[PDB]
Amino acid sequence: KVFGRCELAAAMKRHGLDNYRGYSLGNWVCAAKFESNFNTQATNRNTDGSTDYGILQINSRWWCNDGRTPGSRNLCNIPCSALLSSDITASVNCAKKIVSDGNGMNAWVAWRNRCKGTDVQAWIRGCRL
């Protein structure tokens, strides 16, 4: 599924991401835009044998099990395929753990390259939240 910008913002605010750990809703919507362009089925294989899954591109090396990532851990205790659902619940709950893993939102490279330090409030424009 491909979320409209405000549609995703609503879904995220609904799952408690607005201001979570000090990160405004805009930060999350912006991370989502550049990590997967709001596509829940988005996937990117990495050169280290891992794969990034879903709307927030969660990595299989440490966060979910896809059965084909060497020395992989499953800290979020879920199959990576669960991160490809139209329901973002799984991704959000896993994301909540990642953002508290000692690097803030820096865990998402796209957020770091395209959202950090910017006027992220613009990603929430036009949304009746």
Swiss-Prot record:
<comment type="function">
    <text>Lysozymes have primarily a bacteriolytic function; those in tissues and body fluids are associated with the monocyte-macrophage system and enhance the activity of immunoagents. Has bacteriolytic activity against M.luteus.</text>
</comment>
<dbReference type="Pfam" id="PF00062">
    <property type="entry name" value="Lys"/>
</dbReference>
<dbReference type="GO" id="GO:0005783">
    <property type="term" value="C:endoplasmic reticulum"/>
</dbReference>
<keyword id="KW-1015">Disulfide bond</keyword>
<comment type="similarity">
    <text>Belongs to the glycosyl hydrolase 22 family.</text>
</comment>
<dbReference type="GO" id="GO:0016998">
    <property type="term" value="P:cell wall macromolecule catabolic process"/>
</dbReference>
<dbReference type="GO" id="GO:0050830">
    <property type="term" value="P:defense response to Gram-positive bacterium"/>
</dbReference>
<dbReference type="InterPro" id="IPR019799">
    <property type="entry name" value="Glyco_hydro_22_CS"/>
</dbReference>
<dbReference type="GO" id="GO:0016231">
    <property type="term" value="F:beta-N-acetylglucosaminidase activity"/>
</dbReference>
<feature type="disulfide bond">
    <location>
        <begin position="64"/>
        <end position="80"/>
    </location>
</feature>
<dbReference type="InterPro" id="IPR001916">
    <property type="entry name" value="Glyco_hydro_22"/>
</dbReference>
<keyword id="KW-0020">Allergen</keyword>
<keyword id="KW-0326">Glycosidase</keyword>
<keyword id="KW-0732">Signal</keyword>
<protein>
    <recommendedName>
        <fullName>Lysozyme C</fullName>
        <ecNumber>3.2.1.17</ecNumber>
    </recommendedName>
</protein>
<feature type="domain" description="C-type lysozyme">
    <location>
        <begin position="1"/>
        <end position="129"/>
    </location>
</feature>
<feature type="active site">
    <location>
        <position position="35"/>
    </location>
</feature>
<feature type="disulfide bond">
    <location>
        <begin position="76"/>
        <end position="94"/>
    </location>
</feature>
<comment type="subunit">
    <text>Monomer.</text>
</comment>
<keyword id="KW-0964">Secreted</keyword>
<feature type="active site">
    <location>
        <position position="52"/>
    </location>
</feature>
<dbReference type="InterPro" id="IPR023346">
    <property type="entry name" value="Lysozyme-like_dom_sf"/>
</dbReference>
<dbReference type="GO" id="GO:0050829">
    <property type="term" value="P:defense response to Gram-negative bacterium"/>
</dbReference>
<feature type="binding site">
    <location>
        <position position="101"/>
    </location>
    <ligand>
        <name>substrate</name>
    </ligand>
</feature>
<keyword id="KW-0378">Hydrolase</keyword>
<feature type="disulfide bond">
    <location>
        <begin position="6"/>
        <end position="127"/>
    </location>
</feature>
<dbReference type="GO" id="GO:0005615">
    <property type="term" value="C:extracellular space"/>
</dbReference>
<dbReference type="GO" id="GO:0005737">
    <property type="term" value="C:cytoplasm"/>
</dbReference>
<dbReference type="InterPro" id="IPR000974">
    <property type="entry name" value="Glyco_hydro_22_lys"/>
</dbReference>
<dbReference type="GO" id="GO:0031640">
    <property type="term" value="P:killing of cells of another organism"/>
</dbReference>
<dbReference type="GO" id="GO:0042742">
    <property type="term" value="P:defense response to bacterium"/>
</dbReference>
<keyword id="KW-0081">Bacteriolytic enzyme</keyword>
<dbReference type="GO" id="GO:0042802">
    <property type="term" value="F:identical protein binding"/>
</dbReference>
<feature type="disulfide bond">
    <location>
        <begin position="30"/>
        <end position="115"/>
    </location>
</feature>
<keyword id="KW-0929">Antimicrobial</keyword>
<dbReference type="GO" id="GO:0003796">
    <property type="term" value="F:lysozyme activity"/>
</dbReference>
